């Protein structure tokens, strides 16, 4: 399978690198949210944009995860497409070629599309579509790095929280109406020296021995609403009271995340 | 006799510096802002001095509209104010006035079936605007044979140059195309003494030529002779030899 | 085996199988099983266009689209496509199991799906797959999947009882001589498969008019 | 009337002209294009390296608005998998193969204009022509430059006759977050920078495992040959006394849109003698023989600045 | 400089206006911008971003370039909205009946407008289609700038006609009264 | 999917569901589900199979086939909507949701473990025979659950330390997710919970879903009792109210209404409210809840 | 050794041509001003589309470059202005290329083929003139490749594919009838002084008082007179 | 652009009536097959076949690539047909066409089913090396039987092509550069050929052996028989058409073989005429 479009590697399949033959918990839970760096204006040509970075551990160890978002202004839709009084909102998320596993740009992996819908669900609620008929806003995120069967879902939740956080920033730089800033958040339940109960605001999966459950929320600060929530667990119904906390910790995480967004937007633009 | 290639300005001497009449310009010649005429196509120049025109003749198979040209158009579709037709395949569609046809009134209009063959005089040709085809000259009030075709017929493709010869009055002699007449039996040389055969011919600058006869056999014979001559420029004798050859194969 | 050449696999056909569809059909020839659901003549949100979609249940993309193109064109000659210009007709066919002669089941099942929908049909279009079986001659009407690998297989579709063939497809080699005997066999099979098909349509109607 | 900025979107070409050849003004009247940078002026390169953790080598090149992120990914290709392998001879005791890198396709570049890059370039569509033509250009230059040696990529068994068990395959993928400047110029410099930053892990075959193995805590650096750097420009002509011709270096997107002829030159000064690795002109009659030659002087100046940017 | 969602005011004190989304009787901003108030009728508040990318609204003057001229209509990209250049470009069509309300049947597209010209017109109505609709009927609306078929910049001589300076040829087009 | 509805009729549906008594269009109570006709073993040639039909008329056939693979993904889903390309994003998400429920069970994956270096793999193909008239996740969840129940995995006569061996006679094969009669796990269920204002409703109708204020998909698995059952929550996800994608209503004759008037339906701009989400989860996870009713009936369903 | 070509090879096409030189055989089809698919269409001026079809295999990314170069160069020659929205389609299929006996066949190659370019520019120009498309001027193009093994420099013209790989540097040039460079591309390690010598050597094909200018004219002359035999 | 050019209805009538009378626009009877010219390129493995106005050229490529994991034993053989914008202005690059899809599959089966090529001969190393024989069918001008012309070209091009010789030394295979070692012939067992029949009347009354393009748009349906001279038929493809009675179908197959044989004699002769010029002996 050689693209007529793109340069092709050797017909024989390549082999990944092979190496010759216990992280302590990073920080306090409530303020555990990793310090973030958000700047609007990363790309001018687009109506709006933003770039988000996160620190792998403690303060400024490395730039482990990096997001760049491109929002296109209210764009005239295709002539053949059916007229819509509501503004069409479309989200495209592509993992960069640089990840633990090489991901083809063409592939648009199933893992990647899943994020696009969630992000599409979070941003869609915030946008006011009734004010722009025959208009199509295209939100696009290209992920430079990932955070860092069961382990996969946890890593994914963190990337989602950042994608909804950059998007809110992007949507603001463009004149795209938003009921409220949408901030990403994460939460999870972990066990430490028989301390099963505690909830950590930022998962930090590798550090935790095992993670019982996790939630990713998109609270709209100033409006008591969650646009998107997705949670994986094996939680006994009798223990459901914690789920309420885990969800509530997530939105407490989002408010913290919102602070960066509000501050960057509020700070000199 | 002068031979030109694109980008080789025609020399000033060949141009007539006697501007009693501003010079009309023929195909393949372009006028730069200063009074210099530059060929735009490969071909042989002709002075046409008696006329106030210069043209360079290049035989191609694709027709770009020219006003007052006569075209063999086909009606694709109908619209409220107009009939849409194609001069040549893959052209931008032409616009034919609904009321253009002779004797037309808002109360009386001819209906043209989809896919009906139509003959038309080009009404306007502007690079900026899509072509428009008229049926009747407004002054005469008469189409003069121009219009839709109902007869039993077929349209055959032709090189634009061979088409020009047919449309030109001197098809025989200076034009050198007289196969149409040869098959007609007017000419003595054929010697068939057949008393002739009946064919109806409508030729267009679009490069597609209509031939219609009551007999199916008639259409093919005229056509094959016509088409064979285009593809291969034929010595009038060779044309004679071909018509006889096509005639013998006929039964 | 255990089947005489004249004999065909057991057939059970259901019409109006889908509770709520313009037309539906369920055909099982021996082990092979096919389900068809047809949207009624309808306009998407000149002659009408038939789309054929075949989905093979999990137990080659070129082979499928080739089969889709075959069923559509065959049904299109029988179907009175010309009557409704602006309408589109969609045939959705799903195969639960395969025992060979898959194409034949699809065209047969689809033709049963059409008559249910009420779309005008010039005639039943019915097909079977026959083989030569090598100068000894025992031409076979119904081809097992086992038998098709061993012996050359020819699939033939006819316009009902008439000898006319709308579709004839053979992807395995045969000598020209053997063919003349192979097609007639298939033709004989088609009328049998029409007969069962016509019975299925008639029996449902008798109950419908009764109901 | 001159509604400020409203005028520009209409009648764009003339607006560039007025600023290009200012009428007598109470000003220096230096030719200023809409970008604000004189024609001799050039966008300022800014390169930052080591950004991507996952890639073996990483490099970010910025030319104002335009930006390129390059990453070098190392993969090991078993010698048995590649068709047409023939064991090399370290030294010989006149026939040339197509090339170990070429026949084995050992280097696989790809330049990827982001959907985010430009209003012009958008997602969900097969690759745009400019993106594809640029990719091959980088490929062609990399093999003609001989920037990365074929020998360094080989993997040797080192038996206590020595033989090659496999070739390192180096994947180079680039992504533009934004596109407001000449594409190729920013990319090639990024590719050279990234290859320099590449630090493939030292690899040793284990006989008992029968599998090529890489060693943690082992670092080797690819030896890049030369530092070929490029500069590209496009001509603006006052046509829509021969029409005035102006040469525009490192063009902005708009300028690319209203200019029909471009030039790109690749030159290396490391040897101390000016060397022109590749030239390309298209779409105009402005770049005659005299203009071509002297563009290398602008290129030499561009080469001298880039080495300060690229450590 | 309020962020999206600042609680601008109680509905009683002020009235909803552009840039404001009102929920639960507490008006809120919907864009990051500098607020304004207009001050029988209560006051109106609005928030405006620092290109606005405004959607064309009916009755608004627009400056636009003609991609093509066609017998029944004119096809024109809406390059600019008054005081806001559009980074987002939406096509707009002008009808034959709309170009000049006087002498409607006599008005022809070819004579009124020509490709490559820039026209100033109102929005008669929303698209009812992919292409928005515009009209140059008002006397003030007309071709503001033109490029001759020869390519020479043309200077207006009369309201009906434009003159090419070097050619001396005159092309008929509607030109703006102002 | 994506049903089209007039502004008014959507306005009537929203209000009807809003009233303190939830006056639904069909008269079904919030808890009640619509009639369902199901069969198991319909699909031949599979370790497991199932088929289901709805009052809407939407129907599906789902098949589960497994082959041991050396210890890569342990469970694989494939969806084949007729008018949908495999590439379409919505389906991949839906498939993912279904997959999330099964894999997070722990018990299900544990059931699949055979050896440290060998593991059973479950390949699921979900086929919508009916036209995709309305949203399809509800049918897919029950269908997959049923087929999983029917799945028979051949018994392994290997002591279970050695490379594995199996028995030919299929009847010996133990049913996956066996019936109650050790604690007996139940295959996972994935259902959609809709909420109009304060009221919560289940088995949402296509016409109902359009007016949805909030919509969540909650996935639960239970441990049989051998106050009926002990239930466990695994996956929750938010399906965007199709409501947003709808016509606006012109008020009877103010860019945004200063006050929300009765007759006009405006696409619900905000997101879900925190209080609603927790209660919506509470109802589904309650003991004696709707979940047990559904799950038990599916266990009651005939097998092969 | 000497160029050989024919016009009207493909009857159905508005214009067609075949060119053979240096062991390169190209057959090209030109289609007159045509309605343009809106995505391809540019309103104010026409869009010229060039399709380069490989003799074997499928169109490479390099093949995408070879067509982009040809389009830009040929658009200046062609008079885009005359036909507003028309699409001019140039399609080239290479029947034969000089074999490299020294390496087995590799179907997909990423490098830019400088050696096929010289034949295409000459092939298309011949076809376009048969179409009659309006042109400001006519242009010819050849390629020069420099080899250093001999010492000093050896000039190799209309190079073969094995030659370009062995050669130190390759350079391709193209000249309008009004003698000016329309396109120039070079790859390798060379010096501008050596380039200027290649430009003046390349200049010879363009100006004469092989002989490219005469070739195009002569080839056209025979067809022109052949077409105009009817004048008699 | 309109996706398909449609013949003017007035034209569509003349051809139907002509065919009923037996007269043909082409000027030759219904049974006829247009004159065939087969010309081989000087380079090995290139063949250009011309029927009337339609020309198709086929070139054979044989790269060594890694085998598919599914079937490590068999090498890959692919026939790639691409309808071109040069063919007709309508056809667009990188966009599929109904005719283009069918042509490749029908042809591919004809060679494969006859099995002239050996999957066993193609594999070099079972694990990692296999031959990649290919033929690229280029359509130069589209009048009439593109399928029939491509088949005669594909079969001709394949036989003329020479693989790069292979020799195994010290139990190590070595693909030999052409200069290093002479080329190898194609190991061709038997030759398939393809013939297309077209029916133009309701009930399939009229049958035409070779169809002009104008004739091709009018005809109701068509069938294509693929037959080896000895009579073993690799493929039969009446994929769809107005119902044609079987008796006429069978009659057309016997006629086809008579047309196949005369094709086989020309191609074998043509291969000889060129071979003698290259290697006199």
Swiss-Prot record, chain A:
Compartment(s) where it occurs, according to its Swiss-Prot or TrEMBL record: Cytoplasm; Nucleus, Nucleolus
Subunit structure, as described in the record: Component of the RNA exosome complex.
Alphabetic keyword roster: Cytoplasm, Exosome, Nucleus, RNA-binding, rRNA processing
GO cellular component, as recorded: cytoplasmic exosome (RNase complex); nuclear exosome (RNase complex); nucleolus
Purpose of the protein: Non-catalytic component of the RNA exosome complex which has 3'->5' exoribonuclease activity and participates in a multitude of cellular RNA processing and degradation events.
CDD domains on file: RNase_PH_MTR3
InterPro entries tied to this protein: ExoRNase_PH_dom1 (IPR001247), ExoRNase_PH_dom2_sf (IPR036345), PNPase/RNase_PH_dom_sf (IPR027408), Ribosomal_Su5_D2-typ_SF (IPR020568), RNase_PH (IPR050080)
Short name of any one Pfam family annotated for the protein: RNase_PH
The name this protein goes by in its record: Exosome complex component MTR3
Record-stated family: Belongs to the RNase PH family.
Main location as per UniProt: cytoplasm
Superkingdom classification of source: Eukaryota
Alphabetized GO MF terms: RNA binding
GO BP, one annotated term: rRNA catabolic process
Keyword Disulfide bond: no
Endpoints of the signal sequence: none
């Amino acid at each position: 399978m050689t693209d007529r479009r793109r340069i092709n590697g050797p017909a024989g399949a390549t082999i990944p690198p092979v190496y010759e033959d216990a992280l302590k918990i990073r920080s306090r839970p409530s303020n555990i949210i990793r310090k973030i760096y958000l700047k609007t204006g990363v790309t001018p040509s687009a109506s709006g944009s933003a770039y988000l970075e996160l620190e792998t551990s403690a303060n400024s160890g490395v730039s482990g995860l990096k997001l760049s978002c491109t929002v296109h202004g209210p764009r005239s839709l295709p002539r053949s497409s059916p007229f819509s009084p509501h503004m069409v909102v479309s989200t495209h998320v592509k993992y960069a070629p640089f990840a633990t596993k090489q991901r083809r740009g063409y592939l648009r992996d199933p893992t990647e599309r899943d994020l696009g819908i969630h992000l599409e669900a979070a941003l869609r609620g915030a946008i006011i579509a009734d004010r722009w008929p025959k208009s199509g806003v295209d939100i696009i995120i290209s992920i430079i790095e990932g955070d860092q069967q069961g382990d996969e879902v946890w890593d994914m939740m963190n990337t989602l929280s950042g994608c909804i956080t950059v998007a809110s920033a992007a949507l603001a730089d463009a004149g795209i109406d938003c009921v409220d800033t949408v901030a990403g958040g994460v939460a999870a339940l972990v066990q430490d020296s028989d301390g099963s109960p505690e909830i950590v605001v930022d998962p930090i999966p590798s550090e935790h021995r095992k993670i019982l459950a996790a939630c990713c929320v998109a609270y709209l600060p100033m409006r008591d609403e969650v646009t998107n929530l997705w949670f994986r667990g094996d939680l006994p119904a009798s223990d459901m009271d914690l789920y309420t906390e885990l969800v509530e910790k997530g939105i407490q995480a989002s408010r913290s995340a919102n602070r960066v967004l509000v501050d960057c937007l509020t700070e000199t633009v | 006799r002068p031979f030109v290639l694109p980008g080789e300005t025609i020399d000033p001497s060949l141009v007539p510096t006697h501007p009693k009449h501003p010079l009309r310009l023929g195909p393949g010649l372009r006028h730069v802002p200063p009074s210099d005429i530059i060929p735009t196509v490969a071909g042989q120049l002709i002075t046409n001095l008696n006329k106030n025109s210069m043209w360079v003749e290049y035989n191609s198979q694709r027709y770009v509209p020219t006003q007052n040209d006569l075209v063999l158009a086909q009606v694709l579709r109908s619209t409220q104010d107009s009939y849409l037709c194609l001069i040549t395949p893959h052209t931008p569609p032409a616009t034919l006035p609904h009321l253009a046809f002779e004797s037309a009134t808002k109360k009386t209009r001819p209906q043209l079936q989809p896919g009906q063959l139509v003959y038309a005089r080009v009404s306007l040709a502007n690079r900026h605007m899509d072509p428009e085809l008229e049926c009747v000259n407004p002054s005469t009030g008469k189409a003069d044979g121009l219009g839709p075709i109902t007869g039993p017929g077929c349209v055959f493709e032709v090189s634009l140059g061979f088409a020009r010869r047919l449309l030109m009055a001197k098809s025989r002699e200076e034009g050198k195309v007289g196969v149409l007449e040869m098959l007609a039996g007017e000419d003595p040389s054929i010697g068939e003494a057949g008393a002739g055969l009946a064919f109806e011919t409508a030729v267009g600058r679009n490069g597609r030529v209509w031939v219609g006869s009551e007999d199916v056999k008639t259409v093919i014979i005229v056509g094959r002779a016509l088409q064979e001559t285009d593809r291969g420029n034929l010595t009038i004798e060779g044309q004679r030899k071909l018509v006889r050859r096509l005639l013998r194969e006929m039964r | 085996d255990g089947r005489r050449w004249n004999e065909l696999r057991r057939v059970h056909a259901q019409i109006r199988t889908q509770a709520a569809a313009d037309g539906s059909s369920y055909l099982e020839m021996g082990h092979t099983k096919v389900m068809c659901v047809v949207t009624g003549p309808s306009e998407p949100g000149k002659e009408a266009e038939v789309v054929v979609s075949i989905v093979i249940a999990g137990f080659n993309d070129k082979r499928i689209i080739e089969m889709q193109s075959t069923v559509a064109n065959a049904l299109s000659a029988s179907l009175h496509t010309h009557l409704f210009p602006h309408s589109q007709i969609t045939i959705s066919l799903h195969v639960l199991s395969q025992d060979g002669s898959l194409l034949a089941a699809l065209i047969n099942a689809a033709t049963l799906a059409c008559v249910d929908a009420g779309i005008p049909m010039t005639d039943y279009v019915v097909a079977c797959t026959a083989g030569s079986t090598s100068e000894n001659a025992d031409p076979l009407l119904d081809l097992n999947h086992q038998e098709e690998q061993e012996l050359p297989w020819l699939t033939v579709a006819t316009l009902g009882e008439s000898d006319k063939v709308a579709v004839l497809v053979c992807e395995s080699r045969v000598q020209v001589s053997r063919l003349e005997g192979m097609l007639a066999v298939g033709v004989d099979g088609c009328k049998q498969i029409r007969a069962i098909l016509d019975h299925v349509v008639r029996q449902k109607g008798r109950r419908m008019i009764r109901e | 009337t001159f509604p400020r900025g409203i005028f520009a979107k209409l009648s764009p070409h003339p607006y560039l002209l007025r600023t290009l050849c200012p009428d007598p003004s109470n000003s220096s009247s230096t030719p200023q294009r809409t970008n604000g940078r004189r024609p001799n002026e050039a966008r300022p390169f800014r390169v930052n390296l080591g950004s991507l953790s996952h890639a073996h080598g990483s490099a970010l090149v910025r030319a104002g608005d335009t930006t390129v992120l390059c990453g070098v990914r190392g993969e090991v290709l078993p010698v048995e998998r590649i068709p047409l392998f023939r064991q090399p001879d370290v030294n010989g005791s006149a026939t040339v193969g197509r090339g170990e890198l070429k026949e084995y396709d050992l280097l696989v570049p790809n330049i990827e204009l982001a959907t985010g890059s430009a209003p012009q370039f958008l997602p969900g569509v097969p690759p745009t022509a400019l993106a594809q033509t640029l990719s091959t250009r980088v490929y062609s230059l990399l093999h003609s430059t001989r920037l990365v040696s074929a020998e360094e990529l080989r993997i040797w068994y080192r038996p206590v006759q020595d033989r090659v068990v496999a070739y390192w395959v180096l994947y180079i993928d680039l992504v533009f977050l934004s596109f407001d400047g000449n594409p190729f110029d920013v990319a090639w410099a990024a590719v050279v920078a990234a290859l320099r930053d590449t630090k493939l892990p030292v690899a040793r075959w284990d006989p008992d495992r029968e599998m090529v193995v890489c060693s943690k805590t082992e670092t080797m650096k690819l030896t890049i040959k030369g530092l070929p750097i490029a500069c590209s420009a496009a001509v603006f002509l006052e046509k829509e006394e021969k029409n005035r011709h102006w040469i525009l270096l490192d063009p902005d997107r708009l300028e690319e849109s209203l200019c029909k002829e471009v030039i790109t030159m690749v030159v290396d000064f490391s040897d101390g003698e000016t060397r022109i690795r590749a030239i390309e002109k298209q779409g105009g009659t402005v770049f005659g023989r005299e203009l071509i030659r002297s563009f290398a002087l602008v290129a030499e100046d561009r080469w001298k600045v880039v080495k300060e940017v690229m450590k | 400089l309020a962020l999206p969602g600042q609680l601008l005011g109680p509905i009683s004190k002020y009235q909803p206006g552009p840039g404001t989304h009102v929920h639960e009787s507490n008006l809120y901003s919907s864009l990051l911008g500098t607020v304004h108030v207009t001050q029988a009728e209560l006051p109106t508040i609005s928030v405006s971003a620092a290109k606005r990318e405004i959607l064309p609204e009916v009755g608004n003057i627009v400056l636009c370039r003609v991609i093509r001229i066609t017998p029944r209509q004119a096809v024109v990209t809406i390059l600019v909205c008054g005081d806001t250049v559009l980074d987002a470009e939406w096509q707009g069509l002008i009808r034959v009946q709309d170009i000049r309300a006087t002498e409607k049947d006599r008005v022809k597209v070819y004579e009124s407008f020509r490709p490559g010209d820039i026209v100033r017109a109102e929005v008669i109505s929303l698209g009812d289609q992919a292409n928005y609709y515009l009209s140059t009927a008002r006397n003030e609306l007309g071709v503001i700038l033109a490029t001759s078929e020869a390519g020479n910049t043309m200077y207006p001589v009369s309201w009906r006609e434009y003159r090419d300076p070097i050619t001396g040829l005159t092309e008929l087009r509607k030109v703006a009264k102002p | 999917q994506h049903v089209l509805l007039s502004p008014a009729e959507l306005a009537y549906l929203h209000a009807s569901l809003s009233l303190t008594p939830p006056i639904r269009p069909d008269g079904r109570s919030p808890t009640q589900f619509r009639p369902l006709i199901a069969e198991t073993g319909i699909l031949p040639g599979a370790n497991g199979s199932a088929r289901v039909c709805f009052a809407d008329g939407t129907e599906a056939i789902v098949g589960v086939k497994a082959e041991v693979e050396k210890t890569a993904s342990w469970v694989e889903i494939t969806v084949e909507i007729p008018g949908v390309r495999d590439d379409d994003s919505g389906m991949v998400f839906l498939a993912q949701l279904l997959g999330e429920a099964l894999l997070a069970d722990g018990e299900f994956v544990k059931k699949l473990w055979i050896n440290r270096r060998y593991h059973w793999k479950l390949y699921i193909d979900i086929l919508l025979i009916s036209p995709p008239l309305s949203y399809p996740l509800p049918l897919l969840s029950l269908t997959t659950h049923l087929a999983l129940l029917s799945t028979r995995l051949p018994r392994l006569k290997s002591e279970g330390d050695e490379d594995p061996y199996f028995d030919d006679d299929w009847a010996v094969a133990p049913y996956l997710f066996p019936r109650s009669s050790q604690p007996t796990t139940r295959p996972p269920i994935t259902l959609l919970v809709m909420a109009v204002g304060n009221n919560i409703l289940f088995d949402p109708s296509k016409e109902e879903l359009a007016v949805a204020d909030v919509a969540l998909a909650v996935s639960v698995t239970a441990t049989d009792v051998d106050r009926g059952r002990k239930l466990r929550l695994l996956s929750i996800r938010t399906i965007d109210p199709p409501s947003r994608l709808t016509p606006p209503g012109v008020p009877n004759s103010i860019s945004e209404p200063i006050e929300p008037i009765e007759g006009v339906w405006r696409a619900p701009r905000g997101g879900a409210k925190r209080l609603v989400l927790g209660a919506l989860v509470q109802k589904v996870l309650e003991k004696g809840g709707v979940v047990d009713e559904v799950l038990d009936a599916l266990e009651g369903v005939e097998l092969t | 050794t000497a160029p050989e070509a024919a016009l009207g090879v493909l009857p159905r096409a508005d214009g067609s041509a075949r060119y053979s030189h240096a062991g390169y055989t190209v057959t090209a089809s030109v289609n007159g001003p045509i309605e343009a698919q809106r995505r391809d269409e540019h309103p104010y001026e026409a869009h010229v589309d060039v399709i380069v079809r490989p003799a074997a295999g499928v169109g490479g990314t390099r093949e995408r470059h070879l067509e982009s170069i040809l389009q830009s160069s040929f658009a200046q020659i062609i008079l885009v202005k005359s036909f507003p929205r028309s699409l001019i389609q140039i399609v080239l299929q290479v029947e034969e290329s000089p074999e490299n006996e020294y390496v087995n066949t590799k179907l997909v190659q990423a490098s830019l083929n400088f050696a096929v370019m010289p034949a295409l520019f000459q092939t298309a120009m011949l076809a376009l003139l048969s179409a009659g498309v309006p042109m400001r001027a006519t242009a010819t193009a050849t390629a020069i490749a420099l080899a250093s093994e001999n010492g000093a420099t050896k000039t190799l013209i209309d190079p073969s594919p094995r030659q370009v790989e062995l050669a130190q540097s390759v350079h391709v040039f193209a000249f309008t009838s009004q003698d000016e460079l329309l396109l120039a591309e070079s790859e390798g390690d060379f010096t501008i002084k050596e380039w200027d010598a290649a430009y003046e050597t390349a200049k010879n094909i363009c100006c004469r008082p092989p002989d490219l200018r005469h070739f195009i004219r002569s080839t056209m002359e025979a067809k022109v007179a052949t077409d105009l035999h009817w004048k008699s | 652009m309109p996706r398909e050019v449609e013949p003017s209805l007035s034209e569509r009538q003349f051809v139907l009536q002509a065919l009923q009378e037996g007269l043909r626009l082409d000027g030759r009877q219904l049974d006829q097959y247009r004159p065939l010219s087969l010309t081989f390129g000087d380079q090995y493995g290139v063949a250009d076949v011309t029927f009337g106005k339609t020309r198709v050229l086929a070139k054979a490529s044989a790269e060594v690539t890694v085998p598919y994991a599914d079937r490590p034993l068999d090498g890959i053989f692919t026939i790639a047909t691409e309808l071109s914008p040069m063919t007709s202005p309508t056809f667009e690059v990188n966009r599929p066409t109904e005719t283009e899809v069918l042509l490749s599959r029908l042809l591919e089966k004809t060679i494969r089913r006859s099995g002239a090529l050996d999957t066993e001969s193609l594999c070099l190393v079972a694990g990692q090396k296999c031959w990649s024989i290919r033929v690229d069918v280029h359509v130069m001008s589209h009048d009439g039987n593109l399928v029939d012309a491509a088949c005669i070209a594909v079969v001709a091009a394949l036989r003329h092509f020479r693989k790069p010789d292979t020799s195994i030394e010290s139990g190590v295979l070595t693909i030999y550069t052409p200069a290093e070692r002479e080329p190898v012939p194609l190991s061709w067992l038997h030759t398939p050929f393809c013939v297309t029949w077209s029916f133009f009347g309701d009930e399939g009354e009229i049958a035409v052996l070779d169809a002009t393009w104008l004739e091709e748009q009018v005809r109701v349906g068509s069938c294509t028989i693929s037959m080896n001279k000895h009579g073993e038929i690799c493929q039969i493809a009446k994929l769809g058409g107005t119902p044609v009675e079987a008796v006429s179908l069978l009659q057309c197959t016997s006629i086809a073989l008579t047309k196949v044989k005369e094709f086989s004699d020309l191609v074998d002769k043509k291969l000889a005429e060129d071979f003698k010029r290259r290697n006199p002996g």
